Amino acid sequence: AMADSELVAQWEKVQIKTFTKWVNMHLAKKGRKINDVTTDFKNGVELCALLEIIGETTIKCVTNPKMRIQMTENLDKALRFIQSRDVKLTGIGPTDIVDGNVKLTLGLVWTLILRFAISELSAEGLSAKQGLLLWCQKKCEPYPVKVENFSESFKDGKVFCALIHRHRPDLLDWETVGEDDRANLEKAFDVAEKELGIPKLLDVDDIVNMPRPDERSVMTYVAALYKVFSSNDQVEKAGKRAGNFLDLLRATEGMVHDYEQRAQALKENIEAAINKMNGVEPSDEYHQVKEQINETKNYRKGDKRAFIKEQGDLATLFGQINSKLRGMKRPVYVAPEGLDPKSLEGYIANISEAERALRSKLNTAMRNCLIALRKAFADPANATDAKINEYRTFVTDETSEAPLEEQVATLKAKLEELKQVEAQLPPIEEAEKACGDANIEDNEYTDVSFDDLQFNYEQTVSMFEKKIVYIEAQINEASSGVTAEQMQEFKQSFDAFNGGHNGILDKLEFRSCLSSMGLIDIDFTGGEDAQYDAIYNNVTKGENGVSFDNYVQYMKEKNDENPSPEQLNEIFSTIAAGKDSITETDMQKAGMSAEQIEYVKANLPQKGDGYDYAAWVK
Amino acid sequence: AMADSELVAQWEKVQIKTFTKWVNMHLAKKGRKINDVTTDFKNGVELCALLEIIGETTIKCVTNPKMRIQMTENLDKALRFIQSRDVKLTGIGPTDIVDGNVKLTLGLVWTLILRFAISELSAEGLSAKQGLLLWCQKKCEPYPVKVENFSESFKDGKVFCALIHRHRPDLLDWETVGEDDRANLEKAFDVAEKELGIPKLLDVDDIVNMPRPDERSVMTYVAALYKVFSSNDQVEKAGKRAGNFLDLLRATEGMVHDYEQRAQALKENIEAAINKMNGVEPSDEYHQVKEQINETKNYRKGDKRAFIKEQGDLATLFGQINSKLRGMKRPVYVAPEGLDPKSLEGYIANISEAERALRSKLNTAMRNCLIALRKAFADPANATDAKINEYRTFVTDETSEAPLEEQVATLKAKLEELKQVEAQLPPIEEAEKACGDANIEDNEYTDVSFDDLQFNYEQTVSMFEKKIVYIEAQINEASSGVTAEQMQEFKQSFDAFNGGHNGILDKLEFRSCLSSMGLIDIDFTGGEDAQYDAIYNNVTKGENGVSFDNYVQYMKEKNDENPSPEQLNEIFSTIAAGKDSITETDMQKAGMSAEQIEYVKANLPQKGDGYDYAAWVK
């Protein structure tokens, strides 16, 4: 019977803890927390922040008021906001909150619970407390619970469970509740804490011990029932975070499209290039293989660069996107068969093999091409040097005992044959020149030169021609008055003066010849010599040019001008008047230029009084 | 006794022939000849030419006078010249010569013989005939001859011989004359004819037959005695011809000096060149052998040309001078030993051999030089490719069963060793480049390239580094919250973004990295991003750069932003208010962008009314 009064005190102790737990449930949204409503509101600051959250209005209370006037001034403005909303003002002034009056402060925390948690639940004749009760009565209708108030009804804790299942059957089982006061209460409070976001405003020990739980406290835990809604409606903002999370996944999905676009391009472009290398056939021509070698240099400078680089970059892309997935705890991306990075690396290894196989083909094409070019020249140059030298040996061979007229037949034979090789020379000149265009600079094949060929040819032909004329001259020594060794001299000069093998001496050629022989003082280049013009007319019968026959006729006439050995004897005799030794004196009387005389003196032997010419008969 | 009168007639016959023979002896100097003095003077022309030779004066008689007046006019002027010189005029008029009077004409031919042959031989009381007789008497003093007149004295012919011997003992022997009238006479007349130039004015038959030879005739043959002098004094002009002959020989002698000067120069210049070729030592350097090869090209273009040409020209000079000698019937010129044309030809053959021996040495220098250059590159390239590939094989070999912490020790071992080969690469690059400067274009020695070396190196080192980090990551998976496959992704991106091996991410490098990951919209090149600047400050503690440790710390914080699999479950539950299948409707009420919704619809499986997320718990 005594129970009544005793009960009220312990209720106050419970009501102070639960009212505290209700304030910092809203304050925690702003990082703020309080220990005790009866002491932490004395400065007015913590009330303004609580009013600002539940009120959606900016109050500017003085952040740490030290003197009583700022605290009281604080509560005039902060309280005036409270009073603006139809909360029951009743007794309270600002000083009542500064001075820390328990029962009035609890009454003030009570009014803003009705105003800000359950106000709208007024319903055409229903207070905040009543409508909330009817709300509770509705929600547990399927359940074997008896709900009369906010004390006795809640004590079993069977009604706490019935509210959560009705809204969320997912997280709390019903076929569970029995004689475990502690279990069902803890069951509810932890469920509210972990998935509903409601703090355990109520202590599990403090309810099982008491005859009745405090109405206001349990009424307050009713604000906690809605504060679970309140939190979730703010966790719909937390649910909008998953929109950013959705964005990230959708972006990550996109970059795999960029990978696959690029990976396919690389596979395409590679297979293509391999084919171009595999498609080219190595040349035979040097300049062609040179260009073919140059085209592989063009690849390695440009596309090869690009093919290795993109492969790496795509290995990086792949790893970067899977970095994202792994970190967002979604399953890893695997690429479509043969387009994963390691298969991409393999195509690189495939083209790195195609080029090496083609450069190998092309190296060897160059070697073979180059040996060809050297053999092009060496093999015929060797064969041709051999021929021109066999003929050389032959005209050099002094010894033949056969008749002289037989010698020239045989000689003229061999020359005709050797003259035939002349033809095969200019192909050899080509092949040497072709080696110079191919910048070849050694030839293991031949030590011969084309110039050596031409010189050996031209030399050996002259040796043939020179022997055949000379043996011709020895046949005709008989019939005509010209020693074979004299004909040689004539032919030697004539041929030396006739520039081509046009078989005649020009007007101009003849002059150069005679000026050499000193038959006219060398006036050959410039002037129009009346003397020469007369000599040339004479010599060239109608050949417009000096036939060799006409040349020899001229020379014979020049020779015929000269005196005989014995005719020259008589010439001297006449000077000396028959003396064998010729004195300077009688000779002088003959009147020769001193030059003439000194020449005699220096030439022929002195024999006493004069000089002998019996030596000159020899 | 009767003899007297008979004798006079035959004398006239003899006197006409000898007077004729005397006229044409002088006329022959002008190509003119007459048959008969008694008939050939009737036109006056032949007398004028005879007077012009013996008189040294130009008469202009009418060249062929047809009418008697020109002939007579002719003889007035021509006779007047005769009369000018103190010849005895006596009876003769011009008509006497036209009419062809024998005795007067003979008398006229007689006077000009005295005037023009023996005049000056008048001597302080002596006629022309007498002084000539005393002249004869003097000259035969040593001889057993008796000289009284110009008839009987000369008949034996012993006096004719005595005159010639006295002047010229050379050509007619004295110990000879006997009873041969015919011999001594013929002996004299032929001697006078061949060497004295006097025609046989006297007939050998006509003297032996007669009692006396005609005085005037034999007197005339006395003019022939002097006409032999007269001829020789004109053959002193013929002796001046030998001055021209002397000139020719002296010129021919000169040209042998020009030959010897030139032949010596050629011998000198050749021996010298041979020595320069024999003196050069073939190079080892390519560019050097190239230049050495080029110097032989310079010879063949220039000096070789000149050396062959001068040799020929001097063969021509030699033959030309001996042409002159041979034609002037002097003995041939022989050249001083080793400077004759055929020895000159031999020195040509000697230098034609020195060049061929040197080009052979130089060909081979090139070949050996070039093989060196290829082996320079091929041998180390082959050895080095082998090493980098043995290490490649090793990191490729998947299989080792030994502890993971042992694997990384062993791995880091091999990498350190392989890293050592890095050094030997740039010498190989040189040797390849050196082959390009030596324009080598094939290499039988190696199919390797330097680029292949560098790529195989750089690739294989990355493969080592990538395995060692990954096995490092597997050791530290335990202690720190990062899967080894996640570390790989981090390291792969980081290394990909750090340009050098400076072990940090730049301000600039970090941006490029994050813009890639899309952690800020790609504003990386241009602008000064307040956001990024704030992020960079945060991340780089004081490294002025992003340490990898700092990079991983950043990435871990980005990962920590993401929700749990089961945390994400609760996020969905809250949207559906505890429904397992999520309807478009309640979700829509949550207010996601339609893009978000369509993404869900397209991603997760439809399970009745809504879409399942039990799949996403996996």
Tab-separated table of N, CA and C in Angstrom, chain B residues 218-327:
chain	number	residue	atom	x	y	z
B	218	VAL	N	140.506	21.027	-179.927
B	218	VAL	CA	141.311	20.637	-178.788
B	218	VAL	C	141.532	21.868	-177.920
B	219	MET	N	141.625	23.050	-178.544
B	219	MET	CA	141.630	24.308	-177.805
B	219	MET	C	140.313	24.419	-177.030
B	220	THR	N	139.211	24.067	-177.701
B	220	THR	CA	137.914	24.087	-177.050
B	220	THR	C	137.890	23.090	-175.895
B	221	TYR	N	138.512	21.925	-176.081
B	221	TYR	CA	138.511	20.960	-174.997
B	221	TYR	C	139.355	21.519	-173.861
B	222	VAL	N	140.138	22.553	-174.173
B	222	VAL	CA	140.854	23.276	-173.143
B	222	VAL	C	139.870	24.111	-172.311
B	223	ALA	N	138.840	24.678	-172.955
B	223	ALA	CA	137.771	25.310	-172.190
B	223	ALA	C	137.092	24.291	-171.272
B	224	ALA	N	136.966	23.045	-171.752
B	224	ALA	CA	136.472	21.909	-170.985
B	224	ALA	C	137.375	21.623	-169.780
B	225	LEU	N	138.695	21.820	-169.914
B	225	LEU	CA	139.595	21.662	-168.777
B	225	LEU	C	139.203	22.641	-167.669
B	226	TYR	N	138.974	23.907	-168.036
B	226	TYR	CA	138.530	24.896	-167.067
B	226	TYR	C	137.060	24.720	-166.718
B	227	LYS	N	136.239	24.268	-167.672
B	227	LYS	CA	134.824	24.079	-167.395
B	227	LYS	C	134.649	23.054	-166.276
B	228	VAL	N	135.652	22.182	-166.093
B	228	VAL	CA	135.710	21.269	-164.954
B	228	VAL	C	135.907	22.057	-163.661
B	229	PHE	N	136.749	23.095	-163.706
B	229	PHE	CA	136.916	24.011	-162.585
B	229	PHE	C	135.604	24.754	-162.334
B	230	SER	N	135.046	25.289	-163.426
B	230	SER	CA	133.838	26.096	-163.507
B	230	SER	C	132.664	25.348	-162.884
B	231	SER	N	132.517	24.083	-163.287
B	231	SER	CA	131.534	23.210	-162.678
B	231	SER	C	131.779	23.035	-161.183
B	232	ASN	N	133.025	22.763	-160.771
B	232	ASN	CA	133.300	22.520	-159.359
B	232	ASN	C	133.044	23.779	-158.533
B	233	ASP	N	133.362	24.955	-159.089
B	233	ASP	CA	133.059	26.201	-158.400
B	233	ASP	C	131.547	26.388	-158.281
B	234	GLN	N	130.767	25.780	-159.190
B	234	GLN	CA	129.312	25.771	-159.072
B	234	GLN	C	128.854	24.588	-158.212
B	235	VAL	N	129.738	23.596	-158.020
B	235	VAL	CA	129.468	22.415	-157.210
B	235	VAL	C	129.934	22.704	-155.776
B	236	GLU	N	130.481	23.912	-155.562
B	236	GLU	CA	130.714	24.488	-154.245
B	236	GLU	C	129.380	24.991	-153.689
B	237	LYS	N	128.496	25.459	-154.583
B	237	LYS	CA	127.072	25.598	-154.322
B	237	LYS	C	126.456	24.222	-154.062
B	238	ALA	N	126.813	23.209	-154.870
B	238	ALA	CA	126.390	21.840	-154.592
B	238	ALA	C	126.959	21.352	-153.253
B	239	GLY	N	128.134	21.876	-152.868
B	239	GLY	CA	128.776	21.596	-151.590
B	239	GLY	C	128.114	22.333	-150.422
B	240	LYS	N	127.372	23.411	-150.719
B	240	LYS	CA	126.588	24.166	-149.750
B	240	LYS	C	125.285	23.425	-149.453
B	241	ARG	N	124.864	22.548	-150.369
B	241	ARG	CA	123.747	21.651	-150.116
B	241	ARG	C	124.043	20.785	-148.886
B	242	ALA	N	125.277	20.261	-148.794
B	242	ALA	CA	125.736	19.461	-147.662
B	242	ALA	C	125.654	20.229	-146.343
B	243	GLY	N	125.562	21.564	-146.407
B	243	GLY	CA	125.242	22.389	-145.246
B	243	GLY	C	123.825	22.131	-144.739
B	244	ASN	N	122.846	22.063	-145.656
B	244	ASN	CA	121.501	21.619	-145.316
B	244	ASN	C	121.518	20.190	-144.779
B	245	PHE	N	122.340	19.303	-145.363
B	245	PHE	CA	122.466	17.915	-144.930
B	245	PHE	C	123.065	17.823	-143.529
B	246	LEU	N	124.070	18.657	-143.286
B	246	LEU	CA	124.671	18.834	-141.971
B	246	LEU	C	123.664	19.316	-140.917
B	247	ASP	N	122.842	20.324	-141.259
B	247	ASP	CA	121.714	20.801	-140.463
B	247	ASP	C	120.775	19.671	-140.042
B	248	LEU	N	120.452	18.795	-140.997
B	248	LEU	CA	119.505	17.722	-140.744
B	248	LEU	C	120.083	16.780	-139.700
B	249	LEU	N	121.359	16.420	-139.873
B	249	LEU	CA	121.990	15.504	-138.939
B	249	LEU	C	122.080	16.158	-137.556
B	250	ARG	N	122.450	17.442	-137.548
B	250	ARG	CA	122.605	18.140	-136.283
B	250	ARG	C	121.252	18.268	-135.576
B	251	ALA	N	120.155	18.463	-136.335
B	251	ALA	CA	118.812	18.476	-135.749
B	251	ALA	C	118.420	17.106	-135.200
B	252	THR	N	118.708	16.041	-135.964
B	252	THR	CA	118.448	14.659	-135.563
B	252	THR	C	119.200	14.303	-134.276
B	253	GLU	N	120.430	14.796	-134.174
B	253	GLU	CA	121.193	14.610	-132.956
B	253	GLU	C	120.508	15.265	-131.764
B	254	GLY	N	119.959	16.469	-131.974
B	254	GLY	CA	119.257	17.188	-130.924
B	254	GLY	C	118.056	16.414	-130.387
B	255	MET	N	117.379	15.675	-131.269
B	255	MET	CA	116.100	15.133	-130.842
B	255	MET	C	116.346	13.899	-129.995
B	256	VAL	N	117.528	13.320	-130.167
B	256	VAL	CA	117.935	12.256	-129.270
B	256	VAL	C	118.212	12.811	-127.874
B	257	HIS	N	118.611	14.081	-127.766
B	257	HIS	CA	118.745	14.665	-126.440
B	257	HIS	C	117.372	14.839	-125.793
B	258	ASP	N	116.377	15.245	-126.584
B	258	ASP	CA	115.003	15.394	-126.110
B	258	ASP	C	114.429	14.028	-125.717
B	259	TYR	N	114.741	12.975	-126.482
B	259	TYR	CA	114.346	11.623	-126.114
B	259	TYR	C	114.938	11.237	-124.767
B	260	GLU	N	116.257	11.417	-124.600
B	260	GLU	CA	116.959	10.902	-123.423
B	260	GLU	C	116.527	11.612	-122.131
B	261	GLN	N	116.287	12.926	-122.232
B	261	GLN	CA	115.681	13.774	-121.208
B	261	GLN	C	114.307	13.247	-120.762
B	262	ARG	N	113.507	12.828	-121.746
B	262	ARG	CA	112.147	12.376	-121.511
B	262	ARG	C	112.148	10.926	-121.023
B	263	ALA	N	113.018	10.076	-121.587
B	263	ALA	CA	113.121	8.662	-121.222
B	263	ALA	C	113.610	8.483	-119.786
B	264	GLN	N	114.671	9.218	-119.439
B	264	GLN	CA	115.103	9.352	-118.060
B	264	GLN	C	113.978	9.845	-117.144
B	265	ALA	N	113.248	10.918	-117.494
B	265	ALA	CA	112.150	11.378	-116.641
B	265	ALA	C	111.127	10.259	-116.366
B	266	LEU	N	110.780	9.510	-117.412
B	266	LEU	CA	109.812	8.437	-117.273
B	266	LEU	C	110.354	7.333	-116.364
B	267	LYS	N	111.588	6.862	-116.582
B	267	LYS	CA	112.217	5.905	-115.681
B	267	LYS	C	112.199	6.412	-114.229
B	268	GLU	N	112.520	7.696	-114.002
B	268	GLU	CA	112.587	8.299	-112.670
B	268	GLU	C	111.207	8.295	-112.014
B	269	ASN	N	110.222	8.759	-112.784
B	269	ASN	CA	108.920	9.023	-112.212
B	269	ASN	C	108.237	7.693	-111.922
B	270	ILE	N	108.557	6.671	-112.706
B	270	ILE	CA	107.970	5.355	-112.520
B	270	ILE	C	108.507	4.680	-111.265
B	271	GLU	N	109.846	4.631	-111.124
B	271	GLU	CA	110.496	3.922	-110.027
B	271	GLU	C	109.976	4.455	-108.697
B	272	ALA	N	109.759	5.784	-108.699
B	272	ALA	CA	109.241	6.566	-107.589
B	272	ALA	C	107.823	6.132	-107.218
B	273	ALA	N	106.955	6.008	-108.228
B	273	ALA	CA	105.566	5.688	-107.954
B	273	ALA	C	105.466	4.268	-107.408
B	274	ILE	N	106.183	3.312	-108.042
B	274	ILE	CA	106.232	1.930	-107.589
B	274	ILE	C	106.577	1.873	-106.099
B	275	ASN	N	107.550	2.686	-105.696
B	275	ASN	CA	107.983	2.742	-104.309
B	275	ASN	C	106.857	3.214	-103.382
B	276	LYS	N	106.068	4.223	-103.800
B	276	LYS	CA	104.966	4.736	-102.987
B	276	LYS	C	103.910	3.646	-102.782
B	277	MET	N	103.601	2.925	-103.855
B	277	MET	CA	102.683	1.815	-103.696
B	277	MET	C	103.304	0.756	-102.780
B	278	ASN	N	104.568	0.385	-103.028
B	278	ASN	CA	105.207	-0.649	-102.234
B	278	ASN	C	105.387	-0.245	-100.770
B	279	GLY	N	105.231	1.063	-100.489
B	279	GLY	CA	105.529	1.648	-99.185
B	279	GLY	C	104.312	1.705	-98.274
B	280	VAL	N	103.138	1.839	-98.880
B	280	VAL	CA	101.892	1.824	-98.127
B	280	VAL	C	101.530	0.425	-97.598
B	281	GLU	N	101.105	0.436	-96.318
B	281	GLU	CA	100.685	-0.684	-95.484
B	281	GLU	C	99.161	-0.616	-95.325
B	282	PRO	N	98.435	-1.721	-95.607
B	282	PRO	CA	96.978	-1.639	-95.654
B	282	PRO	C	96.451	-1.511	-94.218
B	283	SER	N	95.378	-0.727	-94.076
B	283	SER	CA	94.809	-0.290	-92.808
B	283	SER	C	94.076	-1.426	-92.086
B	284	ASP	N	93.468	-1.076	-90.947
B	284	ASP	CA	92.601	-1.942	-90.162
B	284	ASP	C	91.215	-1.329	-90.034
B	285	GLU	N	91.184	0.008	-89.933
B	285	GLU	CA	89.974	0.820	-89.896
B	285	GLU	C	89.323	0.828	-91.284
B	286	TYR	N	87.988	0.723	-91.345
B	286	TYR	CA	87.237	0.764	-92.589
B	286	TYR	C	87.495	2.078	-93.311
B	287	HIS	N	87.171	3.203	-92.658
B	287	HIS	CA	87.299	4.507	-93.295
B	287	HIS	C	88.729	4.735	-93.815
B	288	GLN	N	89.705	4.096	-93.162
B	288	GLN	CA	91.084	4.212	-93.583
B	288	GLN	C	91.327	3.414	-94.857
B	289	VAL	N	90.818	2.182	-94.914
B	289	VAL	CA	91.040	1.336	-96.082
B	289	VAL	C	90.277	1.961	-97.259
B	290	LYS	N	89.084	2.494	-96.986
B	290	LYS	CA	88.292	3.262	-97.939
B	290	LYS	C	89.114	4.381	-98.594
B	291	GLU	N	89.857	5.130	-97.768
B	291	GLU	CA	90.684	6.211	-98.286
B	291	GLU	C	91.886	5.653	-99.049
B	292	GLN	N	92.480	4.574	-98.514
B	292	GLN	CA	93.592	3.910	-99.182
B	292	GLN	C	93.177	3.359	-100.555
B	293	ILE	N	91.954	2.809	-100.642
B	293	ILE	CA	91.354	2.359	-101.897
B	293	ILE	C	91.125	3.560	-102.809
B	294	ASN	N	90.772	4.693	-102.195
B	294	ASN	CA	90.485	5.850	-103.018
B	294	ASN	C	91.765	6.442	-103.615
B	295	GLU	N	92.903	6.293	-102.922
B	295	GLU	CA	94.153	6.849	-103.418
B	295	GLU	C	94.619	6.077	-104.653
B	296	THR	N	94.305	4.779	-104.744
B	296	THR	CA	94.678	4.055	-105.950
B	296	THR	C	93.771	4.448	-107.117
B	297	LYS	N	92.553	4.902	-106.805
B	297	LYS	CA	91.669	5.407	-107.849
B	297	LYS	C	92.199	6.728	-108.411
B	298	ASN	N	92.829	7.525	-107.550
B	298	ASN	CA	93.418	8.796	-107.939
B	298	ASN	C	94.617	8.586	-108.872
B	299	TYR	N	95.369	7.492	-108.688
B	299	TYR	CA	96.517	7.201	-109.534
B	299	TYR	C	96.017	6.838	-110.925
B	300	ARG	N	95.105	5.868	-110.945
B	300	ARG	CA	94.637	5.323	-112.204
B	300	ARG	C	93.940	6.384	-113.043
B	301	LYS	N	93.370	7.391	-112.397
B	301	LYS	CA	92.670	8.430	-113.132
B	301	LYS	C	93.659	9.396	-113.796
B	302	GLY	N	94.815	9.625	-113.150
B	302	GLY	CA	95.742	10.697	-113.503
B	302	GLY	C	97.112	10.216	-114.002
B	303	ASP	N	97.967	9.762	-113.087
B	303	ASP	CA	99.352	9.469	-113.405
B	303	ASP	C	99.479	8.240	-114.303
B	304	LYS	N	98.661	7.219	-114.037
B	304	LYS	CA	98.677	6.008	-114.848
B	304	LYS	C	98.478	6.362	-116.323
B	305	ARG	N	97.489	7.238	-116.582
B	305	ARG	CA	97.189	7.801	-117.890
B	305	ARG	C	98.472	8.328	-118.529
B	306	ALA	N	99.192	9.133	-117.742
B	306	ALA	CA	100.325	9.884	-118.255
B	306	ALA	C	101.499	8.949	-118.541
B	307	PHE	N	101.719	7.964	-117.651
B	307	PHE	CA	102.813	7.012	-117.716
B	307	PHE	C	102.670	6.103	-118.926
B	308	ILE	N	101.435	5.712	-119.264
B	308	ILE	CA	101.282	4.867	-120.444
B	308	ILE	C	101.472	5.710	-121.710
B	309	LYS	N	101.013	6.979	-121.664
B	309	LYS	CA	100.989	7.815	-122.848
B	309	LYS	C	102.400	8.224	-123.227
B	310	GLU	N	103.178	8.692	-122.250
B	310	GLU	CA	104.521	9.146	-122.571
B	310	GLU	C	105.344	7.992	-123.106
B	311	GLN	N	105.146	6.776	-122.580
B	311	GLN	CA	105.894	5.621	-123.065
B	311	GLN	C	105.638	5.397	-124.552
B	312	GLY	N	104.383	5.463	-124.944
B	312	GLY	CA	104.094	5.331	-126.362
B	312	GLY	C	104.730	6.436	-127.200
B	313	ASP	N	104.593	7.695	-126.748
B	313	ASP	CA	105.060	8.854	-127.484
B	313	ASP	C	106.568	8.764	-127.697
B	314	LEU	N	107.267	8.235	-126.699
B	314	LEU	CA	108.709	8.090	-126.805
B	314	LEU	C	109.091	6.891	-127.681
B	315	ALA	N	108.218	5.882	-127.778
B	315	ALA	CA	108.445	4.829	-128.760
B	315	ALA	C	108.360	5.397	-130.178
B	316	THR	N	107.488	6.404	-130.330
B	316	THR	CA	107.229	7.075	-131.590
B	316	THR	C	108.391	8.002	-131.918
B	317	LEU	N	108.856	8.783	-130.936
B	317	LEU	CA	110.024	9.643	-131.129
B	317	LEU	C	111.254	8.866	-131.602
B	318	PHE	N	111.582	7.778	-130.896
B	318	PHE	CA	112.701	6.899	-131.204
B	318	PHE	C	112.639	6.432	-132.652
B	319	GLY	N	111.477	5.893	-133.048
B	319	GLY	CA	111.273	5.404	-134.404
B	319	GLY	C	111.336	6.537	-135.430
B	320	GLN	N	110.891	7.744	-135.029
B	320	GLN	CA	110.888	8.874	-135.942
B	320	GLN	C	112.317	9.347	-136.186
B	321	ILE	N	113.119	9.403	-135.127
B	321	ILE	CA	114.478	9.837	-135.379
B	321	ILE	C	115.199	8.768	-136.198
B	322	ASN	N	115.041	7.482	-135.899
B	322	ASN	CA	115.733	6.474	-136.691
B	322	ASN	C	115.192	6.396	-138.120
B	323	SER	N	113.951	6.838	-138.323
B	323	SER	CA	113.425	6.987	-139.664
B	323	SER	C	114.339	7.952	-140.411
B	324	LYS	N	114.604	9.100	-139.781
B	324	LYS	CA	115.442	10.125	-140.362
B	324	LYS	C	116.814	9.547	-140.695
B	325	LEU	N	117.424	8.799	-139.769
B	325	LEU	CA	118.789	8.331	-139.953
B	325	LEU	C	118.863	7.352	-141.115
B	326	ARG	N	117.947	6.376	-141.064
B	326	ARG	CA	117.834	5.296	-142.034
B	326	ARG	C	117.692	5.896	-143.438
B	327	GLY	N	116.885	6.957	-143.547
B	327	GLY	CA	116.627	7.617	-144.814
B	327	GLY	C	117.786	8.489	-145.279
